[PDB]
Design an enzyme around this catalytic site. Structure first.
Site, PDB file in Angstrom:
ATOM      1  N   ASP A  49      -4.691  11.690   7.850  1.00 18.46           N
ATOM      2  CA  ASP A  49      -3.488  10.996   8.279  1.00 18.46           C
ATOM      3  C   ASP A  49      -2.957  11.585   9.576  1.00 18.46           C
ATOM      4  O   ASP A  49      -3.012  12.799   9.783  1.00 18.46           O
ATOM      5  CB  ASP A  49      -2.419  11.063   7.199  1.00 18.46           C
ATOM      6  N   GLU A  74       0.862  -1.171   0.000  1.00 18.03           N
ATOM      7  CA  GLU A  74       0.000   0.000   0.000  1.00 18.03           C
ATOM      8  C   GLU A  74       0.902   1.225   0.000  1.00 18.03           C
ATOM      9  O   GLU A  74       1.692   1.417   0.929  1.00 18.03           O
ATOM     10  CB  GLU A  74      -0.946  -0.007   1.203  1.00 18.03           C
ATOM     11  N   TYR A 122     -10.826  -2.324   3.430  1.00 18.17           N
ATOM     12  CA  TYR A 122      -9.927  -1.709   4.408  1.00 18.17           C
ATOM     13  C   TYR A 122     -10.688  -1.592   5.720  1.00 18.17           C
ATOM     14  O   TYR A 122     -11.528  -0.707   5.882  1.00 18.17           O
ATOM     15  CB  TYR A 122      -9.432  -0.346   3.927  1.00 18.17           C
TER      16      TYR A 122
END
Ligand SMILES: [Cl-]
Ligand SMILES: [Cs+]
Lengths: 394, 256
Positions: B60, B49, B175
């Site tokens: 993030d 990834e 995910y």
């Protein structure tokens, strides 16, 4: 999926990580029901009137237009508690928070004015408040940081990225994705993912409602144009909203041209940027050819937002509103002219709007025209900035 | 090409889960990043990834925010990233490669054009971090037209309608971020979702073993690899050795 359209034409949307969608859905729903709740509107209008100072005056300039056929009015949001129009919407978002049963407030600020507004509403209404600030902006604005601390808010510096507003907008969102059960994100302008462009407009629209009633009372006719500066778009859309259907009234938003469009150092994404997806919305923005997001530049820190609310992008595309830019120097001149001829110190942000009105008047002095400028704040915060430039010049 | 299906087919006949490192492309430089990826593959990574440095990664945490800054310091651009992607694919024809993108980089030169370029360099999947399923229609349609699998995050606060959508719209893998896990795994298996990779706080071998035991097809190490790079910025040969040690330890944990 949503009760309201998250798009204005092709602009807007909800471009957030999946984890934040329930927070947005919960916020839209509470807003929709608050809008239908007389008790909420009454408490809102009570605070605006007895705590913030509404309605604000509509001042006819006496001296500034002498020798032309322009009649100029200033909507006096500088007279609002806190010194800027920001106060209207944070009082509404804080009532919204309480209505959701939230106890904590998160906010982002750059120049510090949204941080101060958020801290004062949070103190009044019994909310714990934590504020994120880009460390560059932190020490550049230590007066405003001390204010926020005096009002009990927690101020948290951001060094990530360029350590400015846009990197502050990012860390508040990560906080909220974990804390949205108990905490509310008090976004500071009419941009970001839906429902925020809608919510902020509705909590700022009394500006244009009051202006409409006041101008009809004083001149018996609607204005030819209302003019407002456009950082993120909240003060301008609050002035515009109630006139959008009066198609004879010009809507003019004024983006900061900085050192000049051709220099690339400006803050005018709406007319000189390019559509992209950032901060939860599809909108015009300051970006590189690779698609990275650049900073605005303007001498006024309050117009530092590298994008623009999506409803403004929509109104431009259909031609209902016109958007222009005004340079640092033009805004400085308008600042000086208002002090000397009217005894009013305007914010350098508001000075961009005024500077465009003065241009309209001066380029066509025999044109009869009735103009309203939204004076979005006062300029005490800017005397040091204006002082240093003026002695650096002579 | 369907590298995920083949990968999961062989993994299941061998009763293993997948181990998937995440790493930012060009961190800390372009050439060190290519050695890092070759090290991760040879130490047993089942897939990759890869992140493309973006100015404003609101989805993030700090570890990745700094990786992006390290890459930008190195001069890394999206165009260079796609060049890197072609080299990686040229050396390693079978490992699946997923990109973690932010929407503006996908939108920038046209959405169709972006997914075309992915297919051209042999990318297998794309996760757009800030495009929820509710907004994903133009993105996943462009992905399917170019044989790219669209990856969706299934978060802890997922209700049933979300799982139904994630199960219909996603391909390749799901995910998973951390309602109970085994129930989340089961509902996804009920709805015929792509195999679920657990991707929350996967730092130790015992967590890799837990996820496979709980019914997930594997684990993504979302940042534990970027911290080994941060920890060992001054000694590149230490950095690789500890990356090799960590990865083979994490991949051994997947053989239940
Ligand atoms: Cl009053
Ligand atoms: Cs702007």
């Amino acid at each position: 999926t949503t009760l309201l359209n998250p798009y204005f034409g092709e602009f807007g949307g909800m471009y957030v990580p999946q984890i934040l969608m329930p927070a947005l859905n919960q916020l839209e729903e509470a807003f929709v029901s608050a809008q239908k709740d007389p008790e909420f509107q009454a408490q809102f209008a009570d605070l605006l009137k007895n705590y913030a100072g509404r309605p604000t005056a509509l001042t006819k300039c006496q001296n500034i237009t002498a020798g032309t056929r322009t009649t100029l009015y200033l909507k006096r949001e500088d007279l609002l508690h806190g010194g800027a129009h920001k106060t209207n919407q944070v009082l509404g978002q804080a009532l919204l928070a309480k209505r959701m049963g939230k106890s904590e407030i998160i906010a982002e600020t750059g120049a510090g004015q949204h941080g101060v507004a958020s801290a004062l509403a949070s103190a009044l209404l019994g909310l714990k408040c934590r504020i994120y600030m880009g460390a560059k902006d932190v020490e550049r604005q230590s007066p405003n940081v001390f204010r926020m601390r005096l009002m009990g808010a927690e101020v948290i510096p951001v060094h990530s990225g360029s350590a400015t507003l846009k990197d502050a907008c990012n860390e508040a969102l990560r906080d909220w994705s974990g804390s949205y059960e108990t905490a509310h994100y008090m976004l500071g302008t009419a941009a970001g993912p839906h429902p925020y462009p809608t919510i902020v407009r509705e909590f700022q629209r009394m500006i244009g409602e009051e202006t409409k009633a006041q101008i009809l009372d004083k001149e018996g006719r609607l204005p030819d144009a209302v003019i407002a500066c456009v950082g993120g778009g909240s003060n301008a859309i609050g002035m515009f909203a109630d006139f959008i259907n009066d198609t004879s009234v010009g809507l003019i938003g004024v983006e900061p041209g900085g050192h000049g469009i051709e220099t690339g150092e400006h803050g005018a994404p709406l007319k000189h940027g390019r559509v992209g997806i950032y901060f939860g919305m599809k909108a015009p923005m300051m970006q590189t050819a690779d698609g990275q997001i650049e900073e605005s530049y303007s001498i006024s820190a309050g117009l530092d937002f590298p994008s623009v609310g999506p409803q403004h992008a929509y109104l431009n595309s259909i031609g209902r509103a016109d958007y222009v830019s005004i340079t640092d120097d033009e805004a400085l001149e308008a600042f000086k002219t208002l002090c000397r001829h009217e005894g009013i110190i305007p914010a350098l942000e508001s000075s961009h709007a005024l500077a465009h009105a003065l241009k309209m008047m001066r380029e066509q002095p025999e044109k009869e025209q009735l103009l309203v400028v939204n004076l979005s704040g006062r300029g005490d915060k800017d005397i040091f900035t204006v002082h240093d430039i003026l002695k650096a010049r002579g | 090409m369907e590298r995920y299906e083949n990968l999961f087919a062989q993994l299941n006949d061998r009763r293993e889960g997948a181990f998937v490192p995440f790493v930012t492309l060009g961190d800390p430089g372009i050439e060190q990043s290519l050695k890092i990826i070759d090290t991760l593959i040879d130490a047993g990574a089942d897939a990759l990834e890869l992140g493309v440095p973006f100015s404003d990664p609101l989805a993030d945490g700090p570890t990745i925010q700094n990786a992006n800054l390290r890459a930008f310091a190195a001069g890394v651009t999206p165009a260079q990233c796609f060049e890197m992607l072609a080299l990686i694919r040229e050396k390693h024809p079978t490992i699946p490669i997923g990109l973690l993108m932010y929407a503006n980089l996908v939108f920038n030169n046209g959405i169709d054009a972006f997914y075309a370029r992915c297919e051209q360099v042999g990318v297998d999947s794309v996760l757009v971090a800030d495009v929820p399923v509710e907004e994903s229609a133009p993105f996943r349609q462009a992905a399917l037209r170019h044989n790219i699998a669209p990856i969706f995050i299934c978060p802890p606060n997922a209700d049933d309608d979300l799982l139904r959508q994630v199960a219909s719209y996603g391909r390749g893998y799901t995910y998973l971020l951390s309602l109970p896990l085994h129930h989340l795994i089961e509902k996804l298996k009920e709805y015929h979702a792509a195999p679920a990779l657990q991707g929350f706080g996967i730092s130790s071998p015992e967590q890799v073993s837990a996820a496979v035991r709980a019914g997930a097809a594997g684990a993504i190490s979302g940042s534990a690899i970027v911290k080994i790079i941060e920890k060992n910025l001054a000694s590149p040969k230490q950095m690789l050795a500890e990356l090799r040690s960590f990865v083979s330890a994490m991949k051994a944990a997947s053989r239940a």
